[model samples]
Target: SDVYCEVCEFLVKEVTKLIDNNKTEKEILDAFDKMCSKLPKSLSEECQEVVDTYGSSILSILLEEVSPELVCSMLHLCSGLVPR
Candidate 1:
């Protein structure tokens, strides 16, 4: 529980940083790549809530601005996220 909360806070904190206009698209995504390394390989309901929080919070904004190639990659990554 604590660990999930920790990671959730961490990702939300990083998402705040990502709203900067000073950062390039690549720079923001690079920050995400680095931050995501902190994610646990095994996800549970608690952490997955955090995942959805950040995804909805960030991905929607990003989709409005990012390149199609990057969007494709994002879709690809999400497709592998969970089983139906």
Candidate 2:
């Protein structure tokens, strides 16, 4: 869904900015918690689900400097985001 794709994109950008600043892995993860609060209630829940399921791998891929679109696509959440 487009929502999930956007969420993953948002998260990837957030993590990358932190990574660029040399932020620790723990801080990056904690930032997700903070970022979730800024999202709408429903989207926040979706964000939480994604984090719980693939947070670690997301971080791993990000550390490799992979593109946001690629990371989301790799998760399969962004594979088919065309709106109905």
Candidate 3:
């Protein structure tokens, strides 16, 4: 159920880079939430729990705030790691 530490590390690096480039917390969070919402239901329970905890925050930011262009760019970075 647990995510690989490497996977988490990759995400943290990508997300932190976006944050460091003047992106707001809400923007970074929304990008993450968008990605999480697309995950398959077959993921491990522990993974689901961790995703859900942070995913909700992402959704909240997406709904309540306006994100910058860098957020979209950050999301694109994540998409590159996923298969077609």
Candidate 4:
């Protein structure tokens, strides 16, 4: 489950940044789409499931808790990585 762990770590870091930056729901959704778009073909299946299961709820939680600065910092950290 190394891949799953890695994905979790990435999600945590990215979500933290989004929350910290106080990104709006639309911004978070855009970022999520961008990240999903970058997933490797090999990871499409699992990645899709993860997105389906947690995507909206996660953003909702973040919308409530994160600041704009944190989201900016997180996006900066994730500048060039594959989401899945």
Candidate 5:
């Protein structure tokens, strides 16, 4: 594998330097290609749930570009509401 343990270790340690004060870029380049293939059956179930709840708003936003920060916020928000 091409993975580097040291870089991952540094990243884990550097997690302390993180804050969610900002949002970033788009990754639809991969999603666009994925949408063309067998990616649908394997698509994230959470995605459909998000679209069902938020409807076309977020999907339309994602159509232009995907945002990881957006996904993380939704994940955190959902977990907070899920019962233990």
Candidate 6:
């Protein structure tokens, strides 16, 4: 319940940022762990947790066409609020 939406949105942004920059698939994967490490200590743990829990599914789903809002909902992290 704590910061789930926050972390989910962050994850979506990071994924989109990497892809928009044309980062290689391997780079995107590496960035996942690296991104968690760079967050503040307070958020770092949850960040890693989200990465470990949802990372694989995210990558797989991203391969097919999808919106950021859909990504979060598919993961059930953004269920509380409608995408604006």
Which candidate tops TM-score? 2
Which of the numbered candidates is closest to the native, going by highest lDDT?
Answer: 2
Q: Where is the poorest 10-residue window by lDDT in model 3?
A: 62-71
Clashes of each: 0, 0, 0, 15, 0, 0
Error of 1 at 49 (Å): 13
lDDT tens per residue, model 4, 4-57: 445546666676765554755576556657787788877866776776776676
What would the per-residue lDDT of candidate 3 be over residues 1-84, giving only the tens digit for each residue?
224444655565566555444545565556655665677766544555765675546544533343433444444543535656
Write the residue-wise lDDT of candidate 1 on 1-84 in tens digits. Answer: 245444544554455456434444555445655666576766444454565566544655653555433543454533433645
Write the candidate numbers in order of decreasing lDDT.
Answer: 2, 6, 4, 3, 1, 5
How much is the lDDT of residue 54 in candidate 4? 64
lDDT of each: 0.50, 0.73, 0.51, 0.60, 0.41, 0.67
Question: What is candidate 5's lDDT per residue for 24-64, written digit by digit as tens?
Answer: 22343345344534535446555544445554344344323
> Which of candidates 1 and 3 reaches a greater lDDT?
3
How many Å off is the CA of 83 in candidate 6?
7.9
> Residue 23, candidate 4: how far off, in angstroms?
2.1
lDDT per residue, candidate 2, 18-80, as tens digits? Answer: 765475568766888898879999999899888877676666665564776676776677546
Query: In candidate 6, which residue ranges exceed 4 Å CA deviation?
Result: 1-25, 62-84
- Model 2, poorest ten-residue lDDT window? 75-84
Q: lDDT tens string, model 6, 4-72?
A: 777877777687767654644576557867867689988988877777776665665564557664667
Q: Which ten-residue region of model 6 has the weakest summed lDDT?
A: 20-29
The alpha-carbon lDDT assigned to residue 54 of candidate 6 equals: 65
Cand. 2 TM to true fold? 0.44
The full ranking of all candidates by TM-score, starting with the best, is 2, 6, 4, 3, 1, 5
Candidate 5 lDDT score at position 40: 59
Q: Is candidate 3 or 5 superior in TM-score? A: 3
RMSD of each: 14.9, 8.7, 13.5, 11.7, 11.3, 9.6
Of 1 and 2, which scores higher on TM-score?
2
